UniProtKB/TrEMBL annotation:
Protein name, as recorded: Cyclodipeptide synthase
Disulfide bridge positions per record: C154-C168
GO MF annotation terms: aminoacyltransferase activity
Higher taxonomy: Bacteria, Pseudomonadati, Pseudomonadota, Gammaproteobacteria, Legionellales
Length: 255
């Protein structure tokens, strides 16, 4: 026996009621944007019949910075490795993607935003990189992240490879800067509301306010479970492993 997961948006939802296009960045570290929880999300959003379009950005290519750290591969080649994760996500979540209809689905690959589908992205990164040099608030934000996640990653890797705490910090810094910059590419997709099962990335919020000069239309959502007559996903594996986790475990098998 098993309860049903339902999703609910946090705070006043008028921001959704006035929207026609909804965007969500799909993270490879989440467990909350796959399987039951994704289906839960799509179920809730379809209740807002003003939503004609949903955009999912698959955030996998972003991870090449960390995959390079692990593997020593060239960055584009680390990128191919990283894009295996997005293939895993697509294949794990066909049910949810096809359930959106008649709401139109747009799938966006991170690689398309960073490398063209122009010099649109490199221009966007320049703004983010200038901001890191010039804004002590943003510089501290980035530094704080790269120090924290530098540490987490070096301790993850110390026993299996020769690695420096400085190497890990650099990769984490470039990761965060790319992630911060992407919001400048998201606006090109014409979304009206952006959402996530948790708080919005602070890099993303900062860059948006600074260079658009408008409040970001973000709303989070949370999950709850209820007793129901017939509960779905009962044959689902009861193991909360992110796709990044599984792909790492996978790469340990081949050292």
């Amino acid at each position: 026996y098993k309860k049903m997961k339902k999703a609910k948006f946090q705070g006043n939802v008028d921001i959704i009621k006035n929207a026609q296009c909804l965007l969500m960045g799909i993270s490879m570290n989440q467990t909350h944007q796959s399987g039951e929880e994704l289906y839960a999300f799509i179920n809730e959003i379809k209740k807002y019949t003003n939503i004609k379009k949903v955009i999912f950005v698959i955030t996998d290519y972003l991870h090449r910075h960390y995959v390079q750290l692990e593997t020593g591969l060239p960055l584009e080649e680390a990128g191919k490795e990283a894009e295996k994760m997005g293939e895993s996500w697509l294949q794990l979540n066909e049910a949810s993607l096809n359930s959106l209809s008649p709401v139109e689905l747009q799938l966006v690959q991170w690689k398309s935003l960073v490398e063209g589908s122009d010099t649109s992205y490199s221009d966007c990164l320049s703004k983010t990189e200038n901001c890191y040099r010039d804004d002590p608030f943003f510089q501290q934000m980035v530094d704080t992240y790269s120090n924290e996640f530098g540490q987490k990653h070096c301790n993850r890797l110390k026993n299996r490879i020769e690695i420096t705490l400085e190497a890990c910090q650099q990769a984490a810094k470039n990761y965060f800067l790319e992630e911060s910059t992407i919001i400048l590419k998201f606006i090109s997709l014409n979304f009206d509301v952006i959402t996530y099962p948790g708080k919005c990335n602070q890099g993303i919020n900062y860059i948006y306010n600074k260079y658009i000069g408008k409040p970001l239309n973000f709303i989070s959502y949370r999950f709850r479970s209820e007793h129901v007559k017939n509960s779905l996903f009962s044959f689902s594996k009861k193991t909360e492993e992110s796709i990044n986790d599984a792909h790492q475990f996978r790469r340990n098998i081949r050292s």
